[PDB]
């Protein structure tokens, strides 16, 4: 009974950052060495946990958040960051514990002419709270006039599409990001390593 880390990392398609997937992981054996002993990652940044010192530790739940962002925006996947992605799409708490993992996925998530399938929220009245997901597509009202769900002046669609093209520079290229979150409540521990 091993933990299904392969499902989230090996997934054929990832979610848009505004609709980031969260995989609940429990009552399984966690071989974390399949992750850190790899060489396909360009960013493996851990906060407050040692990935090699979790095999002897047990948790109640582990969350694997997955989505695709730009290379420029990977720096926003970190506690205490600001920007379009941290404020409006995916926010980490200041006391975040876990690892954020990213790797270049130009070969998979970029199509000639542009993928235009991965989206990110561009407009929002207020910043997201940590670990909050907003899938609203309501027309963003930038003025005093109600929009009645129609686009136009002072009325913007809150979602914008990434221009993922193979020609683009490295920072513009799509990057698949997996964020590992560790939870330890008073419930019995179910996620143990070898």
């Amino acid at each position, epitope marked *: 009974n091993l933990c299904p880390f392969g499902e989230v990392f090996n997934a054929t398609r990832f979610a848009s950052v505004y609709a980031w997937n969260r995989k609940r992981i429990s009552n399984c054996v966690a071989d974390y060495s399949v992750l850190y002993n790899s060489a396909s990652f*360009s960013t493996f*940044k*851990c906060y407050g946990v*040692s990935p*090699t010192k979790l095999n002897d530790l047990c948790f109640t739940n582990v969350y694997a958040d997955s989505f695709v962002i730009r290379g420029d925006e990977v720096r926003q996947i970190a506690p205490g960051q600001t920007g379009k992605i941290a404020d409006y799409n995916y926010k980490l708490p200041d006391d975040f514990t876990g690892c954020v993992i990213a790797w270049n996925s130009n070969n998979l998530d970029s199509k000639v002419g542009g993928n235009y399938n991965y989206l990110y929220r561009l407009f929002r009245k207020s910043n997201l709270k940590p670990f909050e997901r907003d899938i609203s597509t309501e027309i963003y009202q930038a003025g005093s006039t109600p929009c009645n769900g129609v686009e136009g002046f002072n009325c913007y669609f809150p979602l914008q599409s990434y221009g993922f093209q193979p020609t683009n520079g490295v920072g513009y290229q799509p990057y698949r990001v997996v964020v590992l979150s560790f939870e330890l409540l008073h419930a019995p521990a179910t996620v143990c390593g070898p």
Partner: antibody
Amino acid sequence: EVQLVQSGTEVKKPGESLKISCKGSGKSLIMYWIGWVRQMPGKGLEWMGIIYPGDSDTRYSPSFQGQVTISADKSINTAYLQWSSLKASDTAMYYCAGGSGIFTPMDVWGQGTAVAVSS
Amino acid sequence: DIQLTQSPDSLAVSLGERATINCKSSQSVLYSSINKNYLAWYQQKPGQPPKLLIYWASTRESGVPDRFSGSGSGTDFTLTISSLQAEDVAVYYCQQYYSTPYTFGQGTKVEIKR
């Protein structure tokens, strides 16, 4: 299998510039944060700063903020600790240590680099 | 910054006896989300770089013999060597990685009481 190897012993005169290096090797290196520790002759350990080589996330101790510059070059898996003008008070053994995250104990240590600043 | 103080500065226990080293923290290094104190113990033989003995105040690094044991919680911690062997002569440091900047203890010198 992560290990750290440092540059050789340095003897310098006050006011000169020095740049010692810390090269790491092995799998799972991309997740190791590289920090520097100073140990003056006969005294204890002082934490100077830390850097994540993936994006050059540099964090300094307040005692050493502005006195040294900590950088890295992720192309060759090498981190650096540099001085603009050395002082005689900088005569100490310098270690580089690695840990698999921020707020994680330093697992891998280098062999140390002796630095002597004298006229 | 979090300050750590050790006691005694020097310790002398006989071969096969027990060595106890205390580490006291200015503030708590416990963390509720993991319920593990972010405390580490290091050993530095003369002319050698420091080596990590115990992390999270109780768990030993791989290859550390069982005679090393860490205990304590919050602001008080102790490092215990059950059967002091001649190869355990070094200076032992406690260090917190709870918050930047990292800070070490002043160090404890352990000798063989002959």
